[PDB]
Write a protein that binds this ligand. Structure first.
Ligand SMILES: [Ca+2]
Ligand SMILES: [Ca+2]
Ligand SMILES: [Ca+2]
Length: 289
DNA sequence: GGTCTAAACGTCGTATAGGAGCATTTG
DNA sequence: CAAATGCTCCTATACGACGTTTAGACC
C-alpha cells in the first residue's frame, strides 16, 4: 500500500487543480463553474493511478490515449481536500491548491450560483495555473486576480514525499560519452536527476541538503544532479531502497542499480563490461519496450 | 602523458500538465 | 427545469532523458 506522503509528493509533481468556467444558456447565471483535480500519465502507468484510487477510495480512472484519474464530484473532491489538508503540498502547486480549495467551498456552498460568487470564482481562476482566456477576460473584464501564496521556507515533510516527487520528476540514467582518453573509448557515468521549473529552486536546494548530495544546474528549469559515484552508492540508492519509487520507473531504477554495481566493480573499464552496460541502458527509460 | 571521475554544458521529444464543453442523470 | 457531473476531445511545454566537452585529480 502506497504511503500518504508518497501520494502528496507524486501530486506535487504530476497533478493539476483546475476550474472550468463555460458559457451556458441553461444556467441561471449563464455560466457553468466546476472544480477538478486530475493526474494524467502515460498509459503504462495506470497502476500508479489504481494505487492512488485504492488509497483514497475515490477517483475515476480512464485509459485511452493516456491514463487519468479524475476527481470532479463534490463527494470525490472532499476526499481530495481532506487528504491534502492532512498531507500538504510543498511546491508552488500548494498555492494552486489553496485557490482551488477556496473555490471548492464557494461551489460546495452554492455561492457560485450568484453573480457575486461567480465573480469571486473568476478572481480565483485568474491566478490558478494559466489564468483567464481572452474570451473569459472579454466576458469578465473587471476581474482582479486573487492573491496567490508565494510558497516559501518549506521543509521536506517526509522521506516518502521525496520518493513520490522523484517518481514523478526524477530520472535514473546511465550516461555514456565518447571519449578517446579512456581505454574503452567511452566514459560511463551513473546519473540521478530531478527536474523542476525555477519557481521552486528553493525546494530543489533543500533537496540537496536533505539528500546530502548533488549539484544545482540551471538551464528556465533547474536540475538537481547527482553524478558522484559513492554519493549514488551510499546515499541515493540506500534512500530509494527504503523509500520506494512507484510506476515503470521502478524498473528503470532497478536496472540503474545493476549498472552502478557494474561500475563500482570497474567493469565499465573493460570492453565486455561496457557492452554489458550498453545492453542494460538500451532497455531503460525511453528504450524500454 | 595516460587514465580516469566529476560535472559543466548542450539539447530533443513527449508524457505530463492544463484546458473546454457536450451529454446525461438527478431531484 | 437547471444543477451536478459523467464523458470526451483539444493543445503544448515543463519536464525526463539522452549526448559532448571541460576542469582537473591521481598515478
Ligand atoms: Ca510537475
Ligand atoms: Ca513523470
Ligand atoms: Ca512531471
Amino acid at each position: 500500500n502506497i504511503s500518504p506522503w508518497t501520494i502528496t509528493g507524486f501530486a506535487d509533481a504530476e497533478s493539476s487543480f483546475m476550474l472550468t468556467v463555460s458559457k451556458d444558456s441553461k444556467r441561471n447565471t449563464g455560466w457553468s463553474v466546476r472544480p477538478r483535480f486530475r493526474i494524467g500519465l502515460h498509459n503504462k502507468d495506470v497502476t500508479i493511478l489504481k494505487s492512488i484510487r485504492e488509497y483514497l477510495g475515490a477517483g475515476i480512472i480512464t485509459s485511452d490515449i493516456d491514463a487519468r484519474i479524475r476527481f470532479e464530484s463534490l463527494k470525490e473532491l472532499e476526499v481530495v481536500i481532506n487528504h491534502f489538508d492532512k498531507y500538504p503540498l510543498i511546491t508552488q502547486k500548494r498555492a494552486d491548491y489553496l485557490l482551488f480549495k477556496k473555490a471548492f467551498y464557494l461551489i460546495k456552498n452554492k455561492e457560485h450560483l450568484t453573480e457575486e460568487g461567480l465573480n469571486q470564482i473568476l478572481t480565483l481562476k485568474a491566478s490558478l495555473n494559466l489564468g483567464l482566456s481572452e474570451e473569459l477576460k472579454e466576458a469578465f473584464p473587471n476581474t482582479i486576480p486573487a492573491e496567490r501564496l508565494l510558497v516559501t521556507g518549506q521543509e521536506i515533510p517526509d522521506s516518502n514525499w521525496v520518493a513520490g516527487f522523484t517518481a514523478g520528476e526524477g530520472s535514473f540514467y546511465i550516461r555514456i560519452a565518447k571519449n578517446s582518453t579512456l581505454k574503452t573509448g567511452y566514459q560511463v557515468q551513473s546519473v540521478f536527476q530531478i527536474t523542476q521549473d525555477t519557481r521552486d529552486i528553493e525546494l530543489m536546494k533543500n533537496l540537496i541538503s536533505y539528500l546530502n548530495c548533488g549539484n544545482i544546474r540551471i538551464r528556465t528549469c533547474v536540475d538537481l544532479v547527482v553524478t558522484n559515484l559513492n554519493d549514488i552508492k551510499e546515499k541515493i540508492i540506500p534512500f530509494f531502497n527504503k523509500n520506494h519509487i512507484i510506476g515503470v520507473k521502478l524498473q528503470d531504477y532497478r536496472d540503474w542499480c545493476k549498472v552502478v554495481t557494474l561500475i563500482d566493480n570497474k567493469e565499465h573499464l573493460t570492453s565486455e563490461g561496457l557492452e554489458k552496460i550498453q545492453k542494460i541502458k538500451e532497455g531503460m527509460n525511453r528504450g524500454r519496450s
